Design a protein around this nucleic acid. Structure first.
Ligand code: MG
Ligand code: ZN
Ligand code: ZN
Lengths: 492, 44, 471, 49, 93, 204, 100, 98, 50, 199
DNA sequence: GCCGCGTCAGA
DNA sequence: TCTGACGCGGC
DNA sequence: TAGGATTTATCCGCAATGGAAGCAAGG
DNA sequence: CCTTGCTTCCATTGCGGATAAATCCTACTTTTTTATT
């Protein structure tokens, strides 16, 4: 059919317009590969992971390439199989890097972002002051939901005794939950469209720029919710997705030292408190205990999503605050600023620069040893090409010996190949220029004098970095765009 | 008048090169760099 | 309220609104719990399935279809005692049960009395209460479906429906009598007459299993739940009164890996346990007892969820013993203990000590700021290991090409058996048996063939490229 | 011992002796830092001090 | 602007459309970019991502920072040609 | 996207829908049991199955129908307990057994309810005599030509259960080993677990 | 299993094990350069599971695929100096080797 | 220092070293802006895709280099997949579209 | 966890070379850039080169 | 010796012959017409159907089963991948190709002319529409041609014989894939004269 | 409606 | 720190 | 910041069978 | 030049004590804490 074409089209990493939205509990379950039910990580004796823990082969794929956990399936015969002793599936261990898990929170829990990001999405959706919402989340005070046939507004909040005498009046036809469960009931029972029309009319009529401003803000958020199609009740977590264990690794160091990522500790306290909440709910505990447990579970989930917007849970035994998911995406040194941009680059070296004033404007002196390292794969190719080496492994041995032939080959692969030179604080675009290298003894990069002012360079210890453009397009860009002999006028 | 960009005629020419600017040239970046590249040599 | 976010504050504020209670109030509350629990015992004891099940279970353990201690935990006023007491119970039960034809209720009451003598395990007791619950749920689904059918399809008011259907729910007097009154909903009582009547019949059946009217079992289980609710409220009062004790005990264990609040929560668990298992009649004040469970639960939970790489509690006991002993040694010998010296103070085989010493190192964070708190932590110094060097990937690729072109040399049969013999460019390599079995000559020929191809390859001018391609 | 050894090994003010001269050492020992516990920070302060 | 070019192409459809230019500092002017990836990668990320989430935004990538993040040919300079061709392949077969 | 624990779009009474269920029980693999209305599958799964046919299985990226394919997939994916022989001759033999059983008797089961009472009684007697003919072979090995529960049984049980629906009470030569074999496979735990309420309904 | 410090290091020619004393340490006074083995150390290793082509290699050439991985300590590249001192600490209990 | 290929980091798959084959040089923001200021799109792409992050593209590139054929397959930087997973691990559903 | 440690001490005699940083005492820094042969250096009437 | 009771042009027999040539094993081929099939076939196959194989103790009908048995007994070279999910998808394609397009060949031959040519148009548009698929990977969702090609390439071979020809775009990838398989030597050595007349 | 104040982001 | 913005509140 | 006491499950070493060498003898 | 065929000799999975691991239970009394540039 054409559905095969639809599928092979979905099997294509070529896309456009990445989207973003809230995650329903069902969607979060859909991402998952299984539920995490235990705070265990590895086995302290044979370090293979536990079953259903933060590192679980059955949930997050195997540890060793193409073999189950219980070693029963190693052979190449079984390569898609699911072992039965350990529920592991025999695939490549890189899947340990993409499968997510999930935790089933025993009680709903507010997503801190949509609560404590300063225009409180929850608040201005419910039109409830953040102070009173927090009053409700910490079980300080009830909140009416569907007062019914009584003198109770839909969001009028009561303290304990007020709700008491309320019950004494009407034991029913009136509902007042407490805690994130209540907030979820409110968010769910709302009507975006009815309230949208109502607020639209109210905005039409009343004339007081504070009220009209708040009103257009709220009507903006409401129409936004009805356009995006995201349910507001999703701003309250019920399933909590857990990160692939390969991204919060528990790598071992030499000598029993284990290095771990804080997310393991944050996840672990979430799971512990969740399990204890389940156990309490079963034991039918005094309501004060269960409330305290729900409170501290909410606290753990907040610490996990954004540690710091509260009492700032620091790590055990180390007097540093833990680092949460927010702290990983957000941050100048955080990923999205350190990752996805400003990346560490291969085929690149660094060294001290000197003058070498015998060069032509398009040349740079490149130390022989540096070049022999930067271009090593070009040299492997060229050696195998001229037969001087039977195999790439032989060629590796050759360039390690530095046989006098690799120097000729090196002078050959360098011939027209321009390299990029970049000085440390690249202020403007002349901070990166392409040069053609002249193989040079010693260990200093020899830089033409006339370009120094461009780099704002001094020969008083400053170092420059060299990069090697690889593809043909890159070499042609370097020669045509970034060659030194093209940047004679400044673009300022 | 352009939407999402500027016309090569409204912009001008000034460049390393000397002719009118070429389509697809990223002027915003080189502008940010020309304005901020000084500065960290003369405050006042 | 001071708009505080610290949960410690909130909990401490909320626990103090309850005040402590005297040592005799403890006896009073314990008496209350006893009231509720013995009441639920008796209310079950009325339900005949209880006594029939107990006697069955003793007769089954006498055939070893059960175990000895899982049936009783003593008698309120031993195999001989067990046999004589279950014979006495059989006597009472048979002289009360068959007398349904009133003296029946009172005789089953006396059977309840003798059942009150016993203290079975909370386990078979839990079996009992679960049976009570499934019976109640049969009653529940019955009423629910029946009223739904006979006020929705029949459109009857609820009052006139319940004042006749309820109360008997096995005899169909409501059914014929309402239609005799000739109401519109009594007419529509013909529509779902069949389903409702058959459900009422199943209810008859369950009652026959109970022998008592659904009215009677409803009264039973309502009494049961009342006693249970009494017990629960008393337990609530005791626990909310001793929360302070829990705080006191937990205070000690602060910095061992769990937050203060996790500690006091595990403590509260232990406290509920102690309240459950606490006997006042021993004249021992409550704190004397509850302290044990609280400290116990806190230490157990510290063992279970403090370390990232969990170690089982016996190993943590060993590690703690080692630390105690090492403190004594260090402060006495002055300098330090060496593992030999420890193994002397302990009796471990001098190598178990070293294992234990290797265990307890805890995982360092992958974010500790590396020297001078610079723009870099430990995390950015841990290289990957699973990957293969792109050089090695290229080597492998060229090796595949090489083997392919070497195998071009040997004749078709030879390269075929070779590629099949190892796993070259196909699925699992096969044992020589299968190589023959597909190769039509199931023989030791195939292994000689493989060897001959290995030679003819290892021969010069064919190997010599691979003796040159030696890797 | 924990407190003391912590102060001596892992502290802002306990530093590897700058040892490539006699001058380097003797100037490391006459150093007067304003940082360290209860002091400033390289970004908090501050054009004035 | 394009709104108006349209609702004045068809003159019957809109008889009214008026605005007032508005000026923001460079920071705020980056906050209010169309593409939440350009923004969240520079400014406060929590606020930008929260808002974009509850709005269900959709980021055509239309830009240099975005196309660098995801690692594909920048829509400027040498990449320009390619990107042109691409948007011609789209909006078509 | 594709959801979860690997749901299956099981017809409530469809024979093939029962085959796959018996298998899944035999592998003991966790899964969902989605039901279709009676014969028209939920109008939404047509986003997956352009044939709109059941049973249909989906594991998070993989859709499958045509029960034979599904059962082979399960036997290969979850390799224990092995539900097929290990030798090519026997595996092909069993594939052919399944092909013949389907193309002979399932067509007849369909015609029974799908033709006039003429075809009804005709095909009923036909399968009756055919079963009483295959009867003596049943005694050989505990299961159908195999010393252990094999995939071909997952073709027999779903039919033997549906004899009441076609009105054939086994009497005559062979109705002994046949009742003993239905005893074996019917009373098999996994087979019990395979049964839906409607599937139990055809039995007392 | 424990690691060994012997000079039994696979597939490194006597040009490589030239300067190691009989116990696996380097001789004092050795002029070394980049890559040279200073301290020959092997670590136990298992579970090879090598690709079919490497298996065919080991077959045609009888190269017994050893089980001890090489982990010796070698001079970093570019630095070429003289060994002027060698210290050896051993956890007590462990038997000392000749050089220690 | 200088490196062609070496060890890579653990969570992100980018270069890093201390083992006398250090990481490569950091190609931070300002250099990216420099390459954008030229029209050099291909240099930039291979700089932040194949030279650094694309776990599969980088080895395809190596094999091409030794084969005398200088071409590149871009794919998608692994750091971006990591960012996706860390967004999804909040309550936020972020995804590529087509 | 460790059995035995072996520490080896290398002595390297680093000679000066183009690239090394040199400095007088008055903040006159500088990176040496050419090792010139003797007969090229300037020299006074007594032929002593600088 | 294994004997195959092949049909002259029966696409089923075509596939069986193709996989036989692919595994490249000797076999006593026997052409058979459905009028008076050899007595021995009717003695063994109660269905009296072709193609049909014997291996000295074993007989199989239903070319699908036959190919499975061959690939399971004669491994080299493999024609089904290892990954049970990949195997399952290939089996699903082997089924769908048949179910959808063999029952179009069956219209164009064994149906009326109106049905014939309507279905010809339908099939033609289907093939031209999915043509971009083969445009990416060498074979039909693979890197090495497999049983799905044994199912597909025969029908593709008889396309002029069904008088179905190609438009501009789809023909490009169609012919690319064709010469890919149309050149494959096993395809040729499997062919018979009864077939080449079609193409 | 207009001013003081707490809160957060950012170097 | 400190600076700015800004909800948020008091006058 | 315990520990005995109970009870079970997991692992480590032992041996029994199937595959593959090793002659060893006819094609 | 071959081309089977009979011994033999080693990996591979039931099959076993020894250890690890998990559970349970204690009775004088002990009751709002901690925690911090
Ligand atoms: Mg300088
Ligand atoms: Zn396994
Ligand atoms: Zn313009």
């Amino acid at each position: 059919d054409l559905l095969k074409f639809l599928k092979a089209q979905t099997k294509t990493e070529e896309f456009d317009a990445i989207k973003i939205a809230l995650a329903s509990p069902d969607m979060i379950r859909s991402w998952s590969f299984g539920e995490v039910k235990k705070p265990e990580t590895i086995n302290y004796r044979t370090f293979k992971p536990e079953r259903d823990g933060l590192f679980c082969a059955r949930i997050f794929g195997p540890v060793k390439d193409y073999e189950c956990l219980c070693g029963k399936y190693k052979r190449l015969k079984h390569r898609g199989v699911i072992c039965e002793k350990c529920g592991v599936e025999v695939t490549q261990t890189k899947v340990r890097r993409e499968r997510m898990g999930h935790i089933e929170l025993a009680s709903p829990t507010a997503h801190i972002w949509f609560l404590k990001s300063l225009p409180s999405r929850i608040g201005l959706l419910l039109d409830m002051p953040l102070r009173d919402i927090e009053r409700v989340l910490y079980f300080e005070s009830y909140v009416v939901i569907e007062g019914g046939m009584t003198n109770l507004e839909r969001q009028q909040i009561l303290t304990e005794e007020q709700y008491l005498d309320a019950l004494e009046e009407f034991g029913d036809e009136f509902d007042a939950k407490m805690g994130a469960e209540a907030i979820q009931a409110l968010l769910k029972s709302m009507d975006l469209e009815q309230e949208c029309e109502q607020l639209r009319e109210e905005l039409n009529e009343t004339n007081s720029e504070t009220k009209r401003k708040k009103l257009t803000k709220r009507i903006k958020l409401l129409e936004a919710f009805v356009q995006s199609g995201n349910k507001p009740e999703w701003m309250i977590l019920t399933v909590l997705p857990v990160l692939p264990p390969d991204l919060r690794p528990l790598v071992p160091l030499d000598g029993g030292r284990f290095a771990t990522s804080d997310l393991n500790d944050l996840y672990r306290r979430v799971i512990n408190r969740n399990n204890r909440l389940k156990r309490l709910l079963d034991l039918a505990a005094p309501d004060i205990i269960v409330r305290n447990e729900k409170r501290m579970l909410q606290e753990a989930v907040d610490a996990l999503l954004d540690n710091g917007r509260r009492g700032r849970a620091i790590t055990g035994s180390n007097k540093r605050p833990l680092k949460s998911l927010a702290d990983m995406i957000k941050g100048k040194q955080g990923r999205f600023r350190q990752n996805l941009l400003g990346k560490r680059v291969d085929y690149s070296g660094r060294s001290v620069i000197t003058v070498g004033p015998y060069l032509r404007l398009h040349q740079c002196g490149l130390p022989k040893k540096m070049a022999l390292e930067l271009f090593k794969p070009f040299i492997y190719g060229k050696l195998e090409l001229r037969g001087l080496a039977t195999t790439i492994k032989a060629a590796k041995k050759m360039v390690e010996r530095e046989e006098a032939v690799v120097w000729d080959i090196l002078d050959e692969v360098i011939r027209e190949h321009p390299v990029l030179l970049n000085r440390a604080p690249t202020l403007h675009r002349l901070g990166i220029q392409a040069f053609e290298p002249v193989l040079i003894e010693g260990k200093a990069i020899q830089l033409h004098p006339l370009v120094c002012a461009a780099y704002n360079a001094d020969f008083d210890g400053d170092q420059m970095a060299v990069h090697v453009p690889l593809t043909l397009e890159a070499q042609l860009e370097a020669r045509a765009l970034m060659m030194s002999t093209n940047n004679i006028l400044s673009p300022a | 008048d352009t939407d999402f960009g500027v016309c090569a005629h409204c912009y001008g020419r000034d460049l390393a090169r000397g002719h009118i600017i070429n389509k697809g040239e990223a002027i915003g970046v080189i502008a940010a760099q020309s304005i901020g590249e000084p500065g960290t040599q003369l405050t006042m | 309220i001071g708009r505080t976010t610290d949960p410690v504050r909130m909990y401490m504020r909320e626990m103090g609104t309850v005040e402590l209670l005297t040592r005799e109030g403890e006896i009073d509350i314990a008496k209350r719990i006893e009231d509720g629990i013995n009441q639920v015992q008796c209310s079950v004891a009325e339900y005949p399935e209880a006594i029939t099940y107990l006697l069955e279970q003793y007769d089954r353990v006498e055939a070893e279809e059960a175990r000895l201690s899982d049936l009783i935990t003593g008698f309120v006023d031993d195999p001989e005692l067990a046999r004589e007491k279950f014979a006495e119970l059989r006597a009472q039960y048979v002289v009360t049960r068959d007398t349904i034809k009133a003296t029946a209720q009172e005789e089953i009451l006396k059977l309840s009395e003798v059942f009150k003598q016993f203290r079975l395990v909370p386990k078979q007791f839990d079996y009992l209460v679960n049976s009570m619950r499934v019976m109640m749920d049969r009653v529940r689904t019955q009423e629910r479906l029946i009223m739904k059918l006979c006020v929705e399809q029949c459109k009857m008011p609820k009052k006139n429906f319940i004042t006749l259907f309820t109360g008997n729910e096995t005899s169909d007097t409501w059914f014929n009598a309402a239609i005799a009154m000739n109401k519109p909903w009594s007419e529509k009582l013909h529509d779902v007459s069949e389903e409702v009547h058959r459900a009422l019949q199943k209810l008859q059946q369950i009652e026959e299993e109970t022998g008592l009217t659904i009215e009677q079992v409803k009264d039973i289980n309502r009494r049961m739940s009342i006693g249970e609710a009494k017990a629960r409220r008393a337990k609530k009062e005791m626990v909310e009164a001793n929360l302070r004790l829990v705080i006191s005990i937990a205070k000690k264990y602060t910095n061992r890996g769990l937050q203060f609040l996790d500690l006091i929560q595990e403590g509260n668990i232990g406290l509920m346990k102690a309240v459950d298992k606490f006997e006042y009649r021993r004249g021992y004040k409550f704190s004397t007892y509850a302290t044990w469970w609280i400290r116990q639960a806190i230490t157990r939970s510290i063992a279970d969820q403090a370390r990232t790489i969990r170690i089982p509690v016996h190993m943590i006991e060993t590690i703690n013993k080692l630390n105690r002993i090492s403190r004594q040694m260090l402060q006495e010998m002055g300098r330090e203990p060496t593992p030999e010296e420890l193994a002397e103070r302990m009796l471990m085989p001098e190598d178990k000590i070293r294992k234990v010493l290797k265990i307890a190192k805890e995982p360092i964070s992958m974010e500790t700021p590396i020297g001078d708190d610079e723009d870099s932590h430990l995390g950015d110094f841990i290289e990957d290991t699973t990957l293969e060097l792109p050089l090695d990937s290229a080597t492998t690729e060229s090796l595949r090409a090489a083997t392919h072109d070497v195998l071009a040399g040997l004749t078709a049969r030879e390269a075929k058996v070779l590629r099949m013999r190892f796993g070259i460019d196909m699925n699992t390599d096969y044992t020589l048996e299968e190589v023959g079995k597909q190769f039509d000559v199931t023989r030791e020929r195939i292994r000689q063939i493989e060897a001959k191809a290995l030679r003819k390859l290892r021969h010069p001018s064919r190997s010599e490229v691979l003796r040159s391609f030696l890797d | 011992s924990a407190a003391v050894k912590e102060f001596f090994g892992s502290s802002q003010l306990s530093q590897f002796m700058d040892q490539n001269n006699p001058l380097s050492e003797i100037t490391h020992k006459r150093r007067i830092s304003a940082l360290g516990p209860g002091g400033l920070t390289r970004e908090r302060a501050g054009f004035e001090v | 602007r394009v709104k108006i070019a349209n609702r004045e192409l068809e003159a019957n459809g809109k008889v009214g459309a008026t605005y007032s230019r508005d000026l923001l500092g460079i920071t705020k002017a980056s906050l209010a970019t169309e593409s939440f990836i350009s923004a969240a990668s520079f400014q406060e990320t929590t606020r930008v991502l929260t808002e974009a989430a509850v709005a269900g935004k959709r980021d055509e990538l239309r830009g240099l920072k975005e196309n660098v993040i995801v690692g594909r040919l920048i829509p400027a300079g040498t990449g320009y040609a390619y990107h042109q061709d691409r948007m011609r392949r789209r909006a078509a077969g | 996207n594709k959801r979860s624990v690997m749901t299956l779009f099981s017809g409530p009474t469809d024979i093939y829908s029962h085959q796959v269920r018996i298998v899944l029980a035999e592998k003991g693999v966790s899964f969902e049991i989605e039901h279709v209305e009676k014969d028209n599958p939920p109008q939404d799964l047509i986003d997956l199955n352009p044939n709109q046919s059941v049973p249909t299985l989906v594991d998070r990226e993989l859709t499958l129908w045509e029960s034979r394919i599904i059962m082979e997939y399960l036997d290969e994916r979850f390799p224990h307990p092995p539900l097929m022989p290990v030798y090519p001759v026997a595996r092909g033999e069993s594939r052919l057994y399944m092909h013949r059983i389907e193309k002979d008797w399932y067509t007849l089961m369909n015609t029974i309810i799908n033709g006039s009472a003429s075809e009804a009684d005709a095909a009923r007697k036909q399968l009756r005599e055919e079963l009483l003919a295959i009867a003596p072979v049943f005694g050989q090995k505990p299961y159908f030509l195999s010393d252990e529960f094999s995939l071909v049984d997952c073709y027999l049980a779903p039919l033997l259960w549906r004899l009441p629906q076609l009105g054939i009470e086994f009497s005559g030569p062979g109705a002994k080993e046949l009742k003993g074999y239905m005893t074996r496979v019917f009373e098999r735990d996994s087979f019990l677990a395979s049964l839906t309420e409607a599937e139990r309904e055809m039995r007392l | 299993g424990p690691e060994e410090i012997t000079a039994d290091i696979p597939n490194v020619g006597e040009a490589a094990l030239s300067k190691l004393d009989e116990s696996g340490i380097v001789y004092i006074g050795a002029e070394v350069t980049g890559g040279d083995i200073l301290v020959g150390k092997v670590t136990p290793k298992g579970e090879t599971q090598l690709t079919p082509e490497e298996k065919l290699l080991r077959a045609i050439f009888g190269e017994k695929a050893s089980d001890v991985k090489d982990s010796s300590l070698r001079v970093p590249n570019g630095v070429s100096g003289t060994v002027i001192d060698v210290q050896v600490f051993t956890r007590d209990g462990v038997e000392k080797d000749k050089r220690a | 220092h200088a490196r062609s290929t070496g060890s890579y980091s653990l969570v992100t798959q980018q270069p890093l070293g201390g083992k006398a084959q250090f990481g490569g040089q950091r190609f931070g923001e300002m250099e990216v802006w420099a390459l954008e200021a030229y029209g050099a799109a291909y240099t930039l792409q291979e700089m932040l895709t194949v030279k650094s992050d694309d776990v599969n593209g980088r080895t395809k590139m190596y094999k091409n280099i030794v084969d005398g054929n200088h071409q590149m397959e871009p794919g998608m930087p692994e750091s971006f997949n990591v960012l996706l997973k860390e967004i999804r691990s909040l309550g936020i559903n972020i995804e590529l579209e087509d | 966890g460790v059995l035995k440690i072996v520490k080896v001490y290398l002595a390297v005699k680093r000679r000066i070379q183009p690239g090394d940083k040199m400095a007088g005492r008055h903040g006159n820094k500088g990176v040496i850039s050419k090792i010139n042969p003797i007969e090229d250096m300037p020299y006074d009437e007594n032929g002593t080169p600088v």
